[PDB]
Amino acid sequence: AKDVKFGADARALMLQGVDLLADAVAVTMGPKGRTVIIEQSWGSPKVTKDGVTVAKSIDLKDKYKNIGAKLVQDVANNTNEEAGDGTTTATVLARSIAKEGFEKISKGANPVEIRRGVMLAVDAVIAELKKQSKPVTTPEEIAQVATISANGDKEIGNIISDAMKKVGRKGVITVKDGKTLNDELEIIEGMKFDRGYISPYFINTSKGQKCEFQDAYVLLSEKKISSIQSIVPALEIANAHRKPLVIIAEDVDGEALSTLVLNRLKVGLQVVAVKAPGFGDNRKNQLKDMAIATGGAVFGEEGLTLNLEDVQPHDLGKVGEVIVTKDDAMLLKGKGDKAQIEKRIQEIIEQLDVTTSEYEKEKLNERLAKLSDGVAVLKVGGTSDVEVNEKKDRVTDALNATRAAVEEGIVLGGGCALLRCIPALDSLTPANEDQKIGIEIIKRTLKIPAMTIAKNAGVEGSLIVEKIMQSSSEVGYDAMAGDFVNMVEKGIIDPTKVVRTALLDAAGVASLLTTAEVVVTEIP
Amino acid sequence: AKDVKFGADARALMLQGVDLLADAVAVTMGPKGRTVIIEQSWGSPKVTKDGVTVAKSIDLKDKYKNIGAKLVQDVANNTNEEAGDGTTTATVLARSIAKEGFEKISKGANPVEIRRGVMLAVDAVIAELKKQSKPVTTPEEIAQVATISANGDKEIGNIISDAMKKVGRKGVITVKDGKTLNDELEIIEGMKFDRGYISPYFINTSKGQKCEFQDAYVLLSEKKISSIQSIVPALEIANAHRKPLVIIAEDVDGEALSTLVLNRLKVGLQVVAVKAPGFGDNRKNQLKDMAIATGGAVFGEEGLTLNLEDVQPHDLGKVGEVIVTKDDAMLLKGKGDKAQIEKRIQEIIEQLDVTTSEYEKEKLNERLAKLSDGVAVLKVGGTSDVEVNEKKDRVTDALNATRAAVEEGIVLGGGCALLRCIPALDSLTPANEDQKIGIEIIKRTLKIPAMTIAKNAGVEGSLIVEKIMQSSSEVGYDAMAGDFVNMVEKGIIDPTKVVRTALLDAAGVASLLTTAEVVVTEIP
Amino acid sequence: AKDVKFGADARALMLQGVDLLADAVAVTMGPKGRTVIIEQSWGSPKVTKDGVTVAKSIDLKDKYKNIGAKLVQDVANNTNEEAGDGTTTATVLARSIAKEGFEKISKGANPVEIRRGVMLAVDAVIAELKKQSKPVTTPEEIAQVATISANGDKEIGNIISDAMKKVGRKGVITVKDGKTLNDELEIIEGMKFDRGYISPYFINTSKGQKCEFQDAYVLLSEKKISSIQSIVPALEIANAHRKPLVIIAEDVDGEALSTLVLNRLKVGLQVVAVKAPGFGDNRKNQLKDMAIATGGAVFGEEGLTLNLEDVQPHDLGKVGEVIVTKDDAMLLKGKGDKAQIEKRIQEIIEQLDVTTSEYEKEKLNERLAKLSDGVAVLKVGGTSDVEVNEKKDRVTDALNATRAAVEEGIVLGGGCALLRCIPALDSLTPANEDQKIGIEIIKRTLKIPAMTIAKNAGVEGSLIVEKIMQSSSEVGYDAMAGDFVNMVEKGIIDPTKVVRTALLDAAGVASLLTTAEVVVTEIP
């Protein structure tokens, strides 16, 4: 029996929910963070200090307060999916925009013009941020940024920069445990394609939300798997060939989905279920390209009249491991046959010399790359399944941060970037009156991240923000030390992609909370 | 133990229920709509901005308030079934008539004469609307209306107008995903008949409430399927011929209904269950016409002594796909044999030259069309299962809007059409006194849609309505821009069929709520 | 633990229950009726406007109020079973007699003399009504009454009068769907006998509370079916001959009853269970007459030594369809052999020439008719399973109304008949004092139907009744128009059978409520 609450009532309750969540996440922000003890049903309390687990763990009771929390959770954690940082920045900015917006609307404003002005200011700030971003291109500044991302370490930074030089920034790098003492890298052959899970229960290792495997044979199709009878002679050669074979054909027609959850969940099957890597004419070429690289053929609809129903283990595919993340898949160590690989590379490099549109050119260049070059596996060693299993996580975080930095440059860390985007954009023209109110709201919640990063350390945040504002254009407060230092000298930076994405998601979700206009909730 | 409430008590409670529903739907009306966050039991909140999902999602608790909501839900959503728009307009008009009617009756009126006067005014307004409707016939204005319906887009408008020119307005157009980049159309052979689901669980794809399939063989009868023993040798050649065969004979005698729900629901059968396309002598001819077009014969009662009990896969039917909507069915790609098709077309075109009544003439001309012409499948491409799967929905909405416009013309959009039907019809003669009260009620709730479309944008609705009323006969307010512009110039239109249908359904359901006269409800 | 309430307490509570029911049914009375929204557990509200469904749907909670409602429900709805109309008139008259009776008894009266006087007045009014009834005999006035019963329609009236002329008023007429456009009639061979259901779960089509079938073979006995072992070799030739054979022998000995509910309910058997058509010596002749007409023989106890235990499909019976209503059964299309039919007709017409008593004469004349003449099936067509399936219901209602009118004539409609029986019968002699009180009660609740039919339309009922009372002897108010018109001219009539039956049932149930004298009810 749905319960329906109109206008400012629903907005007030949703804002209380998001207020609780942002209170509990803004604590663990900055370098001088703070612990937060999230109790666990069975076991010891988890003592964490990062803003993603706190947010995932909070979920209130009142249903108009759980909506406020759930909206920001979804938006911020999808920014986290996009790249790793700023799930806290997004949440705190969203709360600070939504609360001030609700306050101004309660004084008789127009919650369409408020949104219009806020989005005007947000787009202006994104432009100014891209104007102030300092890029990172040369393989030396790449090393410097990798070192800074790895908390001053040099070996991790050196190895990351070395791999980036070896495989090109727009390449593939993966991290694996090393059966040695010190770390090394070894370019191998293989590729990855941007298709992920179809079911969150398909994962193999509950650690890290991933699904890892080992040596396997491949089988692909250009047509959707329409039945489970098409999959009965699929696990047939699975246990009958000592290889957990791989099938990545196309979307499985629902029945196979629940069927395979039944036949792996609590049973433990070892096949794969990933979608098709592209669309249309290029997708068929990519399916046959994976087939030719690994050894087999596409079992769809073709002129050779091949069909997957027959269990043919003949020449499926020589792969290494398959690692299906949430939104990516990686086929490693493909050594089907040497002739076909160089042959297809020749074919692609020939068809490149055809002077076609800037869509087909790039869409075939991607196949060229995926078949010519290869991943750069990063074997990280240690003394220990603690030393290694920790240095792996640290180097993975450093790799993600430096790769996110490479694209859009870097800006001042510590939440001072938006603090520099403030003073440039008092040059906005507000049409209405409430557009100016939206601009004021953004100009007031632009110095929230720096304020909370300072207040977590302990010094009063207003004084620090004012000092930074009246400081130079490169001197920003440093919470780890306690004095205002620099960007180039002190080396505390944030990739621009993270700052921009956090600002965009905060603006979007705060607007959706500032003009709600009945919410409808079920009665408990 | 039924609970019984008499007279104005039941009407008051039902009106409170409809007041809540119309409050929650009138928010999302017009171009400058508003979000509404309908929470979901398992998952994230759904943030919607259209008035159909809100209405379907609301259902109250008090049983005399749930009736008020349920009546308007049913009526408005069947207008939505009839054509796509104005489920919000109907609901808001119905609430505005019912509330004012209850108020006038509470001052000692006669709730039969009130209804009589209201229906007088409604019929007058329908007449005036048809008087002011501007038709769309020439293939250029068709393109203009298609573009306007597709939000200014030209390629979608051009393709819609092109298909309409190719297949004739009173033809068949369908939309399918395109395995390419840009869109195209390809007239194929096939037809559709106006028979739908017999069970809402027969659907295949839960998306869009449809039941799609692929290549199949056909089998039809002129006599009802009286048993399930008649259907035991029906799925026999289903799994034994690799074609999910099609059976559209006549109504299945109940036992087969629940049986097939048991044998597909949680099992997954792939046959069809659609009724007969017509009535009597013509229906037999149509059944045999589908049979001759596809390849087989009608398995009913005839002189050739054929019966469906024998599993004869001999010459059933060469069809393409079958797509059973809620209230329509479409048999595509019929290539049974070339001789029989042209032969039967010759037979029909010969029997046309017989000078019969204007019933048999049209009833045979429909068969002539369904066998001579064919559908115009619209292959829409894109870059992507997001680009395509979105452009498909946009082009489907544009197609429905332009087809609904073709029939009865177009009128001024933005809810100004009824605002133009007001001033013409102060020339009504009310017999009683309460007939004049009904006329006043309609003349006051005729400018509700424009008022709410303006108030959603934000400007006070009374001033806008008054300005429009004292404006010209073609200048209407435009909420997307904010200034009064036009109909021909600005290009904001509403098909007449939608406005008229919304008005009729509002009048009907509001009358039924204005003279309720005990309602009987179960005790919880 | 029974709860026992004595005297005026139980009568007061039962009267409150009947007051609620009559309030809710009296609303939907007359031509200008009123809707009543009876909610349904699963689905949309049912918006009805007839007084039978309202009454069947009401059932209160308090057990001394549910008895008051249940008594009038039973009595009125059995009048409805007898003929179709006046389930509302009976209920309203019963409430108006019982309430006034309770009021007079509460002033110290004698609730035996009250009943005596009331029944005196009721019998007087029945006599006066039969005195004023105008018969309908000639085949032209039959057509006029059929047209009036079909709401002015002429084709329905013409077809009804035509069938009545063809088959004789005391004949058989049935209505079936027509596989054509316009309607027609076709006298066929067959008969019906007055025996119905033995179990309300034996029905086949839940629509209309009937049990319809198709071609079948017959088997009858003169002795009761004493076992289910006698029925094991009965469904044997049921599925083994492709005919759902018919067995109408005699009452089945209980075990077969629950057994056949088990073997059809949720299973779906297709045999029949109807009792014997008569009593004794004539019943045996009728059983063998059905046997000779259809083809077989009676499987009871005889000189030929035949018994049903053997499965003999030899010469059972050539029937058409069997349609078992609640209290009737119809065996259609009997073509066993031509010789035996005319032979038995000759035998009956010979034994007619024997000059016997006026009991055997009629009891054999009925067999003569059932074997010589036949039903007149009425094939009604339409454009459509809506046009037909509605015209069928309209023609069925018209047929029932005209047949009920043929027997006892017709009187003024609109509830003015009793209003004409009032003034004639102030010439009654009351013995006691309370007999005069009963007479006054009837003379005051005789003008209740006209008053409520007027008040439903809207004009104050007292003025209309007084105007009619001081009007002529043929001018009665007309609610559809609004002016006093006529009986012969305006053509608004009610069959006398309905008025008389409604009055009798109202009197009976009101008396039973006016002298209750403890009721005993279970504790919840």
Residue numbers in the entry:
A (entry chain N), B (entry chain M), C (entry chain L): 1 to 524
Show me the paper's own sentences about this structure.
Human mitochondrial chaperonin mHsp60 is essential for mitochondrial function by assisting folding of mitochondrial proteins. Unlike the double-ring bacterial GroEL, mHsp60 exists as a heptameric ring that is unstable and dissociates to subunits. The main function of chaperonins is to mediate folding of cellular proteins.
We purified active heptameric mHsp60, and determined a cryo-EM structure of mHsp60 heptamer at 3.4 Å. The map shows that the equatorial domain has the highest resolution (3.3 Å), while the apical domain has the lower resolution range (3.9–4.5 Å). The equatorial domains contribute most of the inter-subunit interactions, accounting for ~ 75% of the total inter-subunit interface and 44 residues involved in inter-subunit interactions. Center on the inter-subunit interface is a four-stranded β-sheet: β1 and β18 from one subunit connected with β2 and β3 from the other subunit. β strands are shorter in mHsp60 than in GroEL: 12 mHsp60 residues compared with 19 GroEL residues are involved in the β-sheet. Specifically, β1 and β18 are shortened to three residues, the minimal length for β-strands, from five and seven residues in GroEL, respectively. Thus, the three mHsp60 residues, S57, D59 and E522, contribute to the shortened β1 and β18. Overall, mHsp60 has a much smaller inter-subunit interface than GroEL, ~ 1258 Å2 versus ~ 1674 Å2. Importantly, the unique sequences, T35, S57, D59, V112, A516, and E522, are specific to and conserved within the mitochondrial chaperonins of higher eukaryotes including human. Overall, the inter-subunit interface of the mHsp60 heptamer increases drastically by ~ 49% from 1258 Å2 in the mHsp60 alone structure to 1871 Å2 in the mHsp60-mHsp10 structure.
